[PDB]
Amino acid sequence: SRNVDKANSVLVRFQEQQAESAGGYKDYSRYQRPRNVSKVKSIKEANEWKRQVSKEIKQKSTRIYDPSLNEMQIAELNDELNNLFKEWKRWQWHI
């Protein structure tokens, strides 16, 4: 079974739930948006959520200019860009 199963097991999670309470781990490479901006919390945190966006801005930004030729594909990817960049705007606005 692919490690997708093995990384999500209880014995993996529980130590993360201890590291949140005992220290400064818990990533932000895991969770998603969180959907709403104004519901985010103290600045030292949204700081990391923001880079957790800019990185994808860089990946797909590089993924723009590529000759690989799928124009419909780069169209939807282009819209995805605009969406994310708007999110970046939102995270800045909250800060």
Next chain:
Amino acid sequence: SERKAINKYYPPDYNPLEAEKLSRKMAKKLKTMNKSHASIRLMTPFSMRCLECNEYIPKSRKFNGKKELLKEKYLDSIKIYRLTISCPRCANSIAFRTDPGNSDYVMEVGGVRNY
């Protein structure tokens, strides 16, 4: 660290059902567990013809491919799945359906079957 491993060291406290609750809360926030999607390595039973580069998946070929639980449920209750496969020559996704009533597959979106 043996492939067949009988025991796993646990922390000295570890209320197991408590970890089931807290982990059950944790299950919502993660990106992977919630993907609604799936990835499976599989074969092509009925062969293929690509509708983009007209490439032929000749009979049965390994693929890293993607399984999805379909919102349909055959009859009152039977599961029905939809699989996707990328073409080797071009970037194109072709899909399946599994008919439980008629054992054979029926397919859509990007490929045609040879007769």
Next chain:
RNA sequence: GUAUGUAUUUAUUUU
């Protein structure tokens, strides 16, 4: 006998 691989730059080097 549960592959494997690529990328993951935050702190701004003198005109």
Next chain:
RNA sequence: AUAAAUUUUUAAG
């Protein structure tokens, strides 16, 4: 008038 007694498990592929 017979006293005759073998073994035993782990990893990797």
Next chain:
RNA sequence: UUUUAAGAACUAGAUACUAACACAUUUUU
């Protein structure tokens, strides 16, 4: 600007991933 997810409580019960391994299957009605 836009947007709604997160927390508490309750329920009954089985399902996914892997195939590298072995495939005379034989045979009594």
Next chain:
RNA sequence: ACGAAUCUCUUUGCCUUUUGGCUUAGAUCAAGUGUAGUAUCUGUUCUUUGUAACAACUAAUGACCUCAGAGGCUCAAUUUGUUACAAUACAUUUUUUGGCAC
């Protein structure tokens, strides 16, 4: 007239992007299974006193002065307390537990 040089084409020679391994041809061309290993989830409900009067208080920019950025000065309704009034009880002669109806 031949000697000499450049350009073009044809033939011969060289051959130029000219098959880079071994094992049972490496094995097989299936309405079919066994066996071994690893890991846990889906639904519902709930949550996200009024009026009036009196008194007190409420960051940024520019300019000037002083000291070695700080200090001072000037410039483009809300809260609290007190007082008064009104609102939040019951059936036996003057009002609302009828002496009305035909």
Next chain:
RNA sequence: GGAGGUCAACAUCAAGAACUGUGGGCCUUUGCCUAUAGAACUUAUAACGAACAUGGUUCUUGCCUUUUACCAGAAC
């Protein structure tokens, strides 16, 4: 100077049944013959250990898909 030490270093401990030194004669130092002095420790149902482990190579097997890990005999 005596007794000791859960102190050290350096020698020696498997062989013609076997050690070492010395005197004399022959060959030409070695070696052979003869004479003499001293021999701790270990050895005859053979050995320093009145005890008892593992490893390497090579063969023979035993388990038996293959390699580590192994089964039980031998030689070095």
